[PDB]
C-alpha cells in the first residue's frame, strides 16, 4: 500500500521520544509489583496490537516482557518510530494531555504488557503521594528531554543535525530507523539526507544497512555534530 505522510511520521516520532525508559520510569518495578491485581496482565503473540493509533489514551501501559514496536501507517509500509523494552512506559502523558495515541504498538516478540486503566491511575495518584511525586519527576524529565533535542537542532547545518540525531538515537551503536523517518524528524528532504548519510559512510563514520544504521567511528561522528 502507501506510506504514511511525512507529517504523520514526524509527529509520531517526536511524540514517541517522550516514552518512559529506565532512568525516567514513573514507577519502580517494586511499585509495579505492589499493583498486582490492580494492573491488568495482557499477553501478546508476535504481531499482535497492544494499542491502536488515533484511539483515546484510556490508561497506562507498562512493558513487562518482550519488545513492543511503535509505528504509524499501514502494516506493509508502516514507519517504525521506536521500540519499547521491558520497564518502558507509554500512554500516561497522552492521558495527562487528554490526547489520543498517535501511533500503534505491536508486539515484535512474544510480550507481556501491564495495563493501568484511567480510573486506577487516578486512584493511585489520589492515594499515594510518593507515587504521584515520582510520576511528576518522570513526566518533567521525559518532556524536557524531547524539547531540548528539538531546540538543539535549530540554527545548525543539516549534516551536523544528522550526526547529532544519529548519536542521540544510537543504542549499542545502532539506529533502527528508516532513512525516511530520520528525514521526517528533521523536516529534511529525503535526497538531502541520503547524500549526507552517503558522505558519512564514505568517510567511515557509519554503515548504512537495511533500515538500520551503524555508528563505526563515534568520535569522528561527534566531530561532525560540532
Q: How far is CA 172 from the centre of its chain?
A: 16
Give the E-state strand segments of 134-185 in sequence order: 174-175
158 is an interface residue for a copy of itself by CB under 8 A:
no
Instruction: Please tell me the count of residues contacting a copy of itself according to CB under 8 A.
Output: 37
Q: Which of residues 92-131 bind a copy of itself (CB under 8 A)?
A: 93, 96-97, 122, 125-127, 129
- With binding defined as CB under 8 A, does residue 140 bind a copy of itself? yes
Q: Could you tell me if 138 and 20 are in contact, meaning their C-beta atoms sit under 8 angstroms apart?
A: yes
Q: What angle do CA 34, 36, 41 make, to 5 degrees?
A: 140
CB of 109 to a copy of itself, least distance (A): 30
If one asks whether residue 190 binds Cl ion (CB under 5 A), the answer comes out as: yes
Q: How far is the CB of 101 from a copy of itself (least distance, A)?
A: 14
Q: Decide whether 55 or 137 has the Cβ nearer to a copy of itself.
A: 137
Choosing from 10, 142, 180, 224, the residue that interacts with Cl ion (CB under 5 A) is 180
199 annotated as belonging to a binding site for a ligand = no
Burial 28-55 (b: 16+ CB within 10 A, else e): eeebbeebeeebeeeebeeeeebbebee
* Cβ 146 vs Cβ 76: under 8 Å: no
Interface residue with Cl ion among 24, 145, 179, 207 (CB under 5 A) is 179
Whether residue 132 contacts residue 125, with contact meaning beta carbons closer than 8 Å, is answered with yes
Q: Which of 207, 213, 221, 150 is nearest to 179 (CA)?
A: 213
User: In whole angstroms, how close is the CB of 94 to a copy of itself at the nearest point?
Assistant: 9
- Binding-site residues, in ranges, read 23-142
Could you list the residues known to form a binding site for a nucleoside 3',5'-cyclic phosphate, using ranges. Answer: 23-142
Amino acid at each position: 500500500g502507501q506510506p504514511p505522510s511525512e507529517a504523520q511520521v514526524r509527529q509520531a516520532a517526536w511524540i514517541a521520544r517522550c516514552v518512559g525508559r529506565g532512568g525516567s520510569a514513573p514507577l519502580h518495578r517494586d511499585d509495579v509489583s505492589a499493583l498486582a491485581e490492580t494492573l491488568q496482565v495482557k499477553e501478546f503473540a508476535p504481531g499482535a496490537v497492544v494499542f491502536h493509533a488515533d484511539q483515546t489514551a484510556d490508561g497506562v501501559w507498562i512493558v513487562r516482557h518482550g519488545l513492543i514496536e511503535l509505528a504509524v501507517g499501514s502494516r506493509r509500509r508502516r514507519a517504525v518510530v521506536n521500540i519499547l523494552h521491558p520497564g518502558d512506559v507509554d500512554g500516561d502523558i497522552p492521558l495527562l494531555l487528554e490526547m489520543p495515541m498517535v501511533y500503534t504498538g505491536r508486539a515484535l516478540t512474544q510480550a507481556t504488557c501491564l495495563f493501568l486503566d484511567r480510573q486506577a491511575f487516578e486512584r493511585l495518584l489520589a492515594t499515594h503521594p510518593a507515587i504521584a511525586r515520582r510520576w511528576l519527576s518522570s513526566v518533567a524529565q521525559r518532556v524536557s528531554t524531547a524539547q531540548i533535542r528539538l531546540m538543539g537542532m535549530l540554527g545548525r547545518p543539516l549534516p551536523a543535525q544528522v550526526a547529532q540525531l544519529l548519536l542521540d538515537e544510537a543504542i549499542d551503536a545502532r539506529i533502527e530507523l528508516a532513512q525516511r523517518t530520520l528525514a521526517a524528524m528533521l523536516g529534511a528532504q529525503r535526497p538531502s539526507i541520503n547524500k549526507i548519510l552517503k558522505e558519512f559512510e564514505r568517510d567511515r563514520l557509519i554503515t548504512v544497512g537495511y533500515a538500520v544504521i551503524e555508528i563505526t567511528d563515534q568520535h569522528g561522528l561527534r566531530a561532525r555534530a560540532q
